[PDB]
């Protein structure tokens, strides 16, 4: 879990978003790779977007 350097096109678009509708910016990244995936686990095997 490291801090890093935020930059890029679409990200910047978001920056433009807060630029229009005023809200302070705070960044995160994706822990896992994916966005979310309905998944049946081994525990209780409940498929959930994950």
């Amino acid at each position: 879990t490291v801090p890093q350097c935020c930059y890029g096109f679409c990200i910047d678009l978001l920056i433009k978003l807060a630029r229009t509708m005023q809200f302070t910016y705070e960044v995160h990244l994706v822990a896992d790779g994916k966005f979310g995936t309905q998944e049946r686990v081994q525990n209780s095997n409940k498929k959930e977007w994950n």
């Binding site: 978001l14 809200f23 910016y25 705070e26 960044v27 995160h28």
Partner: protein, 368 residues
């Protein structure tokens, strides 16, 4: 062919009053009742369960529920399925014992804490709150009431949002979760369900970060708020007390009006067998007996205007609102069916504000 119904509790003044119950029962025939005291133990509960109860051969047996716990109160009644006799949940308001399957049938004129605290969901207009969250201990009855609030949201489909659920196992080392998502809470509406020491750690946790400050609502009942919770907890928190809930007169005369109503509904009725041994199969009479318990709704008892739910509640449930100033409960009103009742006093927040403010507050920092 005389009627029969049971009860059990510690104070026998109501046992004599039960002799008055069978006595006055003629109000709308005869009734043959073998009274039984309250076996303080499960063993003795089986002792009289066989002795007076099994041998009764009765039409049905109610039981008073003089706990103050689990299903241990009337657990012998929890074994009455072998008889499968009709019964009325009385002197306990815990609806975990009122579950439909494992517990068979105990008719509760007395509040299930969940549907009770739904009165908060009525107060959704009182705070006019379209948003909220869920906070509770982690337990059976807890998860139950959680499903009840889930029913509250279920009836909806702008709307009364509810954020997230807090459920705590006994004696959490830290509520700092609750503190954390608490920080995550824009709205001020915080649902609360707690046992005694549960609500305790709720209080000891409350000022710990002092997020209990204004802009934080704790919505729960006196069932959570009693005793030590009536002692060391934050005063003026959202709460009420179900009318008559502690009233053994509302209980007794309740069994009078209603138990006499359905008792009258009992009169090819096949009463139970006397010998526990020797009766292999329970009397099927329950089909008319419990459906007679529900279908028979007395006019009104000392429990008030008599009604029921599909589970055979009392329906028609008036609980008295309250707010605690100086660690002192003061009735804020009462609500049953039609009642939205403001009281004289005004109930301030943790701050001097009585009026419920607008909880949700946009936070500038926005993480993505």
């Amino acid at each position: 062919k005389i009627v029969n119904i049971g009860a059990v509790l510690s104070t026998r003044k109501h046992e004599q009053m039960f002799r008055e119950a069978v006595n006055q029962a003629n109000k709308r025939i005869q009734l043959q009742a073998t009274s039984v005291t309250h076996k303080p133990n499960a063993i003795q509960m089986a002792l009289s369960v066989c002795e007076d109860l099994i041998s009764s051969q009765v039409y049905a047996i109610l039981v008073s529920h003089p706990p103050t716990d689990h299903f241990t109160p009337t657990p012998v009644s929890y074994t009455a399925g072998f008889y499968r006799i009709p019964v009325l949940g009385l002197t306990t308001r815990m609806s975990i014992y009122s579950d439909k399957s494992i517990h068979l049938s105990f008719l509760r004129t007395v509040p299930p804490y969940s549907h009770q605290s739904s009165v908060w969901f009525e107060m959704m207009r009182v705070y006019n709150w379209n948003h909220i969250i869920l906070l509770v201990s982690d337990d059976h009855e807890g998860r139950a009431a959680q499903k009840r609030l889930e029913t509250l949201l279920e009836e909806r489909e702008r709307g009364p949002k509810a954020e997230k659920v807090l459920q705590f196992d006994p004696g959490t080392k830290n509520v700092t979760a609750l503190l954390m998502e608490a920080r995550e809470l824009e709205a001020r509406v915080i649902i609360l369900s707690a046992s005694e020491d549960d609500a305790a750690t709720v209080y000891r946790a409350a000022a710990m970060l002092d997020m209990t400050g204004s802009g934080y609502v704790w919505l729960v009942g006196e069932r959570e708020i009693s005793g030590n919770a009536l002692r060391y907890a934050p005063d003026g928190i959202i709460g009420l007390q179900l009318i008559n809930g502690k009233n053994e007169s509302a209980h007794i005369s309740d069994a009078v009006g209603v138990v006499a109503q359905a008792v009258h509904e009992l009169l090819n009725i096949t009463d139970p067998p006397r010998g526990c041994v020797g009766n292999t199969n329970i009397w099927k009479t329950g089909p008319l007996f419990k459906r007679v318990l529900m279908s028979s709704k007395y006019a009104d008892g000392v429990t008030g205007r008599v009604e029921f739910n599909e589970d055979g509640d009392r329906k028609f449930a008036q609980y008295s609102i309250m707010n605690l100033q100086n660690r002192k409960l003061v009735q804020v009103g009462i609500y049953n069916g039609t009642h939205v009742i403001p009281n004289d006093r005004k109930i301030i927040w943790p701050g001097g504000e009585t009026e419920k403010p607008r909880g949700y507050q946009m936070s500038t920092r926005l993480k993505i």
